[PDB]
Amino acid sequence: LGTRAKESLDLRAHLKQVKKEDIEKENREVGDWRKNIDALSGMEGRKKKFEG
Amino acid sequence: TTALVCDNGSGLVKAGFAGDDAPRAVFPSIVGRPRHQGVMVGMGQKDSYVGDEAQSKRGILTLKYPIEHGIITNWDDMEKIWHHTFYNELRVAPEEHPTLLTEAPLNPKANREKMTQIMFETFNVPAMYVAIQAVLSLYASGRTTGIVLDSGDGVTHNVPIYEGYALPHAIMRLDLAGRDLTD
Ligand SMILES: Nc1ncnc2c1ncn2[C@@H]1O[C@H](COP(=O)(O)OP(=O)(O)O)[C@@H](O)[C@H]1O
Ligand SMILES: [Mg+2]
């Protein structure tokens, strides 16, 4: 009984390792970028050129 | 060289060199022959006063607009108006200047073809281009989308534009304009 139980335990151990430890390879992607504001400072242009 | 941005319109001809803020010369587009007899000799009476001159002698003239609803109905008078615009209100010979006329949407083809034929044969310009009157009004607003309602004096047309791609199936041209309101 112990042998059969430990067989399944060891079999699932490696699967759990691969599933979980490999998550630590990267988890910062949740972090978003700046997305800064202007605060009425980027108003320094007239209606001179618009195509470029 | 510089380009001539003429804009025939219907009711006021607006013209001027490209790159400025306002048209150089704005004057009504009417050509009026005198109708009475005339007794003073040597007064120097001409046979047709065009432009803003016929808005001062209008007491003895019969003013008649050469453009009815966008389309041009009297080609000789329109040629006279263009000749006046080039030579007396701007004083630049057309042999050395590109021209950019404007035309309402959904107008007859023959009108546009005759316009280009006149500009190339009579005035002999180097190069001319015809543009739809609503896209320009969208340029001036500094936008690139939007639906523009250009209620002129001849014809009211409503051209929708998105991201620079005009929608040709959604142009609604209606012939009520300032002239009908005057009447
Ligand atoms: N300040 C104003 N108030 C009301 N109506 C005006 C005014 N100025 C012009 N209009 C009307 O608009 C007409 C001029 O329209 P305009 O834009 O010159 O036509 P076009 O597209 O042919 O140039 C005039 O006939 C007049 O009836
Ligand atoms: Mg107009």
PDB file of C-alpha atoms in Angstrom, chain A residues 1-13:
ATOM      1  CA  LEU A   1       0.000   0.000   0.000  1.00  0.00           C
ATOM      2  CA  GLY A   2       2.796   2.420   0.865  1.00  0.00           C
ATOM      3  CA  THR A   3       4.649   1.515  -2.326  1.00  0.00           C
ATOM      4  CA  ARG A   4       1.592   2.187  -4.488  1.00  0.00           C
ATOM      5  CA  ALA A   5       0.900   5.465  -2.681  1.00  0.00           C
ATOM      6  CA  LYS A   6       4.509   6.635  -3.039  1.00  0.00           C
ATOM      7  CA  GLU A   7       4.495   5.739  -6.740  1.00  0.00           C
ATOM      8  CA  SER A   8       1.634   8.163  -7.386  1.00  0.00           C
ATOM      9  CA  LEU A   9       3.160  10.735  -5.026  1.00  0.00           C
ATOM     10  CA  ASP A  10       6.511  10.701  -6.838  1.00  0.00           C
ATOM     11  CA  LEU A  11       4.789  10.739 -10.230  1.00  0.00           C
ATOM     12  CA  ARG A  12       2.777  13.836  -9.304  1.00  0.00           C
ATOM     13  CA  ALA A  13       5.768  15.488  -7.606  1.00  0.00           C
TER      14      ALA A  13
END
